[PDB]
Amino acid sequence: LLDKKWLTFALAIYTVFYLWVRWYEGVYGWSAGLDSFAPEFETYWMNFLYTEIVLEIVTASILWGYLWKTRDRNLAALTPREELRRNFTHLVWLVAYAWAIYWGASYFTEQDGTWHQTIVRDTDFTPSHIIEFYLSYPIYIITGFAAFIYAKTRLPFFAHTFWFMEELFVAPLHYGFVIFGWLALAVM
Amino acid sequence: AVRSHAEAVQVSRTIDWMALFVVFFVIVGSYHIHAMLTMGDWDFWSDWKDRRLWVTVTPIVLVTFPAAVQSYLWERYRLPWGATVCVLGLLLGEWINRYFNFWGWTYFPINFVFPASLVPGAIILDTVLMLSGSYLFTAIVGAMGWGLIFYPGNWPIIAPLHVPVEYNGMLMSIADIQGYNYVRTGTPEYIRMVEKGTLRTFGKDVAPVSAFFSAFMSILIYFMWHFIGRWFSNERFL
Amino acid sequence: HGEKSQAAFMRMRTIHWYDLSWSKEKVKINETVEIKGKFHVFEGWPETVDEPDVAFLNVGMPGPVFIRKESYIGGQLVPRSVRLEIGKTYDFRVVLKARRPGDWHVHTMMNVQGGGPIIGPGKWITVEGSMSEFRNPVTTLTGQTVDLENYNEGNTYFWHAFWFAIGVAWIGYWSRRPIFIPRLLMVDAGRADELVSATDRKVAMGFLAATILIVVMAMSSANSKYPITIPLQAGTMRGMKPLELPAPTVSVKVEDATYRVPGRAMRMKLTITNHGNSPIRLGEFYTASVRFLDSDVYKDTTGYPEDLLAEDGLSVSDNSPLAPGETRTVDVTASDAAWEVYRLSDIIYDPDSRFAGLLFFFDATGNRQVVQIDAPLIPSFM
Ligand code: CUA
Ligand SMILES: [Cu+2]
Ligand SMILES: [Zn+2]
Ligand SMILES: [Zn+2]
Ligand SMILES: [Zn+2]
User: Fold this and answer.
1) Residue (of A182, A100, A79, A82) closest to A146 by Cα position
2) Ligand 2 centroid to B105 CA: how many Å?
3) Residues of B in contact with A188 (CB under 8 A)
4) All structural domains of chain A
5) Which of A32, A156, B99, C286 qualifies as a cystine partner to C358, CB 3.0-4.6 A?
6) Which residues does C222 contact at the CB level (< 8 Å), separation at least 6?
7) Of C275, C283, C243, which is closest to residue C367 (Cα–Cα)?
């Protein structure tokens, strides 16, 4: 009942995954990822690429496909309590989305930044490129889409006096979309 | 449904937290991409924090988000921390990186790769727009402030780096020596783009829907135009 | 690392590094290692690489696993960028202090102005010890002797924390009352203002005054401590002293130069002709960091990088002594795994199939002329 710690998943799910990645590149950025023309780079770094692309296409396929087909068909009548339960879960999506953006656009980007400063590149596919570009960006644009789609297919906003608040709660989580409605110009 | 004023006050609180997070990291994320993209940095090195370029570009290229999120948060919530929220965003972003990567991964001393200090400016902006609550006003004196305050704002940090030494027969300041000792390389790829120019916008923002209400109003990156208010700030140096 | 992926003919026609030497090969933390050598800036500088009007004498290595203590080119210390003159030939010296344990592949590079880090041969140097051991002391013209590893570290921290804290404090202050949906609606229906409540404005200006006050108080405090300070020193050193080489005594003329595709060897037909009295022999062709030797005439002892030294890589159709006065045409083959491993073989993709190298001739008592060759290098497939 209300908004659950699925939101806990949504936070840790990246954090474990990416902390594994940071370990992985920390240990192989040196030994393997130094000289691209060496066979250890093929196995530990190049293979990594096609592993993720496949996985990304696949997930993004099942993930968007999932939600779209499970789109709340007749939503004409579904309680205000769900129109609350929902633009909570929706928000969880948007939290995951932001967390994802954080890693992709702050963390892994300014890292690439440091990486460029310390090794003269051998490919357009440095460790930190395999990670910053082809693992990070896809992940968070996928999270992006999901958020959008969830909302589009789940919430019908997608076609004292504590008082003057308390009851402004029939079609509130309009707010939901003054904020997807203003990450808006915030992002670009 | 939903029940009481007791619960209402409750969901609107647990909302505030979730929202604040989203707002905040999505700032950190795109704001840091901005700073990065436009300044391959002066910010990175102590020996690039000079009197002309560093002092000129940094406050200029940096008002954007403050200015924009300023015109959303104050206009629509009367929340006056628009400016500072961005700045804090960038700073955490840059630090976690300077620390865990810049030093953590590749071993550059923190006293070298530390970022520029930014809070003062943002406070000036936020408060000036709060009191005397006209944007036009903030744009002229507020940005003016942000601009000017910048360098003096970093002076307590910068200064001890600027004490002179005769290093093998040449005058050099500490900071100079730092960059001379701690070998970096070239510059060396840039077009950190295709999906950054577009794709990763036009999936984030369709915000739109086809429904309008797009607070995609940044005519308050007129509020930018305090570059002029800024670029005094450098003729400020000698 | 970083060459190899870079255009083969830039790597052949840009800077020639030779008489490279490394004071030591295994080094303890805080110990020194000294890199020496000469480099010639090729008179046929590619197009499309700004002349080195402002170039900088760098070191290639994965970050500061050494720090650069000193760097000289010509007699001179070179902490700035320098102006190098095309065709001219200089001596450098780089002095490194070890800082991180590991096997590092250290190159002498050269950062140029418009396009290109110009990366010389890399040699593996091993560092033993603990980073906790490293020190970087510097004595200022101000009496004090500081350790660069951590100088001003805590200070930097304080100020960033202090200000960060304030930013928090300000957001915090507003975020104790509810932040979005009630405030949003209050702006919506009816006028806002009920919600910003002087004494909110007291606090606002509290902050505003406090901030500018702390900034100036701080600034002039920073000025009271640290009263002697200079601006960042910068600007390109001009006037680099070049090396006064003597005119060579051998002259060579290269008609045809070919390489098999795919392959491992370049061949050229040179007409060597030996002016100046003493029977001369061809001992080496240096091409792009890679050194091809006739081991019947020359033997390296410099500890040159193994993957770049072709000990008997260089074979000449007739390499008997060339008597003074004489002039002969000879077929010469540079051959080594190195030619493929460092991708000179990738000349086939370059839009300018011309090469350039140095030849080294030694006379009977072992003193050597160097001549530079360059010419078009044509592929053969059939
Ligand atoms: Cu990097 Cu040799
Ligand atoms: Cu040359
Ligand atoms: Zn990059
Ligand atoms: Zn009530
Ligand atoms: Zn050896």
Assistant:
1) A100
2) 38
3) 30, 201, 204-205
4) 1-188 (1.20.1050.50)
5) C286
6) B155, B156, B159, B160
7) C283
